[PDB]
Amino acid sequence: KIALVTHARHFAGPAAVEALTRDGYTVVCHDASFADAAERQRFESENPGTVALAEQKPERLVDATLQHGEAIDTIVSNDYIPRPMNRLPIEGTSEADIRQVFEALSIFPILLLQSAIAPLRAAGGASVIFITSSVGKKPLAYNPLYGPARAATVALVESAAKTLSRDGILLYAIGPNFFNNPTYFPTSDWENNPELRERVERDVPLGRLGRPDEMGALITFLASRRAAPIVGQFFAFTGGYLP
Amino acid sequence: MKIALVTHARHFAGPAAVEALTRDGYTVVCHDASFADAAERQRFESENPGTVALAEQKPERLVDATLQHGEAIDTIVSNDYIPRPMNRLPIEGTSEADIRQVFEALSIFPILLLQSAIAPLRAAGGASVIFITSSVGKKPLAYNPLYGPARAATVALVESAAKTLSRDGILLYAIGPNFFNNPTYFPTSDWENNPELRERVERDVPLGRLGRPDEMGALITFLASRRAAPIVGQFFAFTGGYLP
Amino acid sequence: MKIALVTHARHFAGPAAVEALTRDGYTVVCHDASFADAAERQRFESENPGTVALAEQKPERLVDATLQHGEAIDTIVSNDYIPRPMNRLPIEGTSEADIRQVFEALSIFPILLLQSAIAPLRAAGGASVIFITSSVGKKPLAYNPLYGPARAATVALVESAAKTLSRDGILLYAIGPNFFNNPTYFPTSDWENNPELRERVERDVPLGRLGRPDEMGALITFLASRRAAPIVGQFFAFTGGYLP
Amino acid sequence: KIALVTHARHFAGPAAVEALTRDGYTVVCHDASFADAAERQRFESENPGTVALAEQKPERLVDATLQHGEAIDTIVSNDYIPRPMNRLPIEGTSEADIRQVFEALSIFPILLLQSAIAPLRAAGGASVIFITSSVGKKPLAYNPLYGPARAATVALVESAAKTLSRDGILLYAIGPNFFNNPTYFPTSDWENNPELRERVERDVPLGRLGRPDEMGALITFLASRRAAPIVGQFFAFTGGYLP
Ligand SMILES: [Cl-]
Ligand SMILES: [Cl-]
Ligand SMILES: [Cl-]
Ligand SMILES: [Cl-]
């Protein structure tokens, strides 16, 4: 029982790898740092039950993953852009940076998904879980480029599911905010930066950051297919900040 | 054992919830209109080992009646429904009494239930309150112009009340079913007997089939577990991809 | 004679509707609870040119009352409101009578009005029915957990009822205001007296200012013109960019 | 008053050009055919009052427009791709084609908007109206690439308006479907296709295509700024098919 998780060392990657492995999955992992063999060896040694791909092209991850087993049960498309690039404004941002936002958050997941459909269909189905953002559904003033690129991939889920669900290929979008994770809300920020707390207690009904095991629980629940009729929609993971 | 309260237990999502929570280790305390009769209460408790059939019919009294059977309520499934074909009542020609009954059953009844539940649920340190609504709580349909508004009010109640209740650990959710195999709207016999339903599902449901009772059950017990608490306060389509 | 019906004319979006509709050449027939007093009707009619102040108070009877003054209704502005601070009524501690009054004024009253209007508006070859709701009809607010649901029901009424009434030429719309300069929620007095309001608007309203009466009027008369019919059946935020 | 209308020969272009001209604007027009001088001359003589730009690059249209007047009052970002590219599926579609969908429908309007902010702000404000699609908000099975690109630009309007509205630069998105226009619903289609008239009868509450003058009325109403507080949102133009 196999899962592919992209950008494994960032965003929702750590929560997904830990939860899927604890659930009995062999978790095949992609990451930019894995072009270095030393990084692959360290990740695998330090993460029992994982395989660290060398492959870096989005349209080649799936075939690479199939080197390690006969079928993929779950793909976690864990796409991200580092801070502070997610807060790039419109004015003054370079064309290169505009393109890079869409490349990482919109084009990469599409090329991945495209490459997955035929093997996933042939194996009788699978789950594809796209990790997006709260701004995939609800805008924020300081994410005017990031937001559009995230909204594209949420729309991708909603449209693609209309055809892929009949093949047993079940697509979902998760939109986090105030989620304890190394990319946007690392534990070091929570404990050292008094500004984060104060706004969580004001803006987040739950009153705290979402925990890694709570993101893991959502991912393994979707991955179980036990509630497949919720296929094809966006889930806020924001502690009640959305809607 | 965890205590759950399920309203209208014989209808809509009731049977799926009562079965899933019972198999998940809960004592399921159940409300139903038919339980005004002591005999139906006995037969229900007989056919569903573990459950308790409440006599109380008023929404504001269900929580206290449930608390006669345990120390704290872990989960409330507010499984509101109105007898068919009232969900399809049009605007023209419908009596004032029917309009009011639509809002009474689908909007006022759950508000009075939730109102009565806040204080005891806060004192016990939280709970899950899951409202069974409808796909038309989020996306309108031509033939539900009164039922839709009433469902949308209760989805909005979830979205708004969760802004304050989540801090108490009282976690609210709405489920919006369609094409869900259930005794009210899509009984198994309709799937078995009517070729038009199969055709319509093939056309309109990406998943290609009705949602199963145990799939609704799995969503409800996943929510009741609180393991993914940060998804609190939103609406979940349960439609096989028909929504959005 | 080009006739508009505006409800609760003294409140909320009423004054803006009356003024812009009158400017645009409509005979504006107005309902308002104060008009049960004959002194108020005469006064309103002399402060407001060419307007007609209805004595009628029942929602189902406003259309027939209006059709005593002309042959057909071109536009209905269903300007439903409740007095502050009922919009901020919490769930806890609120009386059942108050809960019911919120739905009565904001959900039942527009339905009864709409139901009564379909047959005569259809006979006449169409019309516009514009519901003034609120931003919480689409986006929840922590302190509007009852007002919100009642408003969301009426937005859903527009969305669903439009699926059938649009073929009759009866075009339904919902406007959802916030930070709108009006005597009910954001009076020009409140702006000048509460620096915390001006600070909240600077922080949360992209426009940076309250919406003006003539801007609400411009939206109302544009919809009433039917010049852009294909936008029928949806919700329009009137919030200065606060929504979405 | 000066308006810029892009892709003026397609989609909502002819409706925009006619309505704004009739409302007293000099309408400066972009179009890919205007690289041909003979096409510019034909267009200008056939559309009195308009100016056909030779410029083709999205980030240069604003400066090209301001050679013809002191300030831009309205920009109509009339983005489109030739049909049936709107119906491209995920499987089989080339990477170049995936990229062109986003280029025309997402990147082009961003590069245009970016270039416009400073001159529009210096002139005291303006209106920027993005013509998107109904799939910018609600998914369709046959638009799994077009949908995401449209959804990005809808999200661009919603997010960028949070900051540009303060400058008096008012952004809107219009999302048409079943709109009588030369690209997706030409009148010849209505006459030729009984399936279309049947689908419109079943799915469109208005029971008819939206007229060009009705799109024009919406554009000129928005361009007037008379109802500025509705800034920053998506308007369905679908005869009630949405929501
Ligand atoms: Cl996050
Ligand atoms: Cl159902
Ligand atoms: Cl207001
Ligand atoms: Cl169109």
What is this structure's SSE topology?
4 copies of one chain form a homotetramer.
Chain A: E1 2-5, H1 13-22, E2 26-29, H2 37-46, E3 50-52, H3 61-66, E4 74-78, H4 95-122, E5 126-131, H5 146-164, E6 169-176, H6 187-192, H7 194-203, H8 212-224, E7 234-237
Parallel strand pairs in A: 1-2, 1-4, 2-3, 4-5, 5-6, 6-7
Helix pairs in contact in A: 1-8, 4-5
The complex binds chloride ion (4 copies).
PDB class: lyase
Keywords: Lyase
Assembly: tetrameric
Spell out the helices and strands of chain A N to C.
EHEHEHEHEHEHHHE
Beginning-to-end CA distance, first to last residue of chain A:
35 Å
- CATH architectural designation of chain A: 3-Layer(aba) Sandwich
So, the CATH homologous superfamily of chain A? NAD(P)-binding Rossmann-like Domain
Fold-level CATH name of chain A: Rossmann fold
Organism (chains A, D): Corynebacterium sp
Protein name (chains A, D): Halohydrin epoxidase A
How would you sum up this structure, described in words?
Four copies of one chain form a homotetramer. Chain A is an alpha/beta fold and 243 residues long. The first copy, chain A, has a single domain, classed as 3-Layer(aba) Sandwich (Rossmann fold). Chain A contains eight helices and seven strands, in the order βαβαβαβαβαβαααβ. The longest helix of chain A is centred in the middle third of the chain and has 28 residues, at 95-122. Chains in contact: A-B, A-C, A-D, B-C, B-D, C-D. The A-D interface holds A 89-91, 93, 95, 98-99, 102, 106-107, 110-111, 113-114, 117-118, 135-136, 139-141, 143-145, 147-156, 158-163 and D 59, 89-91, 93, 95, 98-99, 102, 106-107, 110-111, 113-114, 117-118, 135-136, 139-141, 143-145, 147-156, 158-160, 162-163. One chloride ion binds next to loops of chain A. One chloride ion binds at residues 176-177, 179, 181, 184-185 of chain D. Chains B, C: This is Halohydrin epoxidase A.
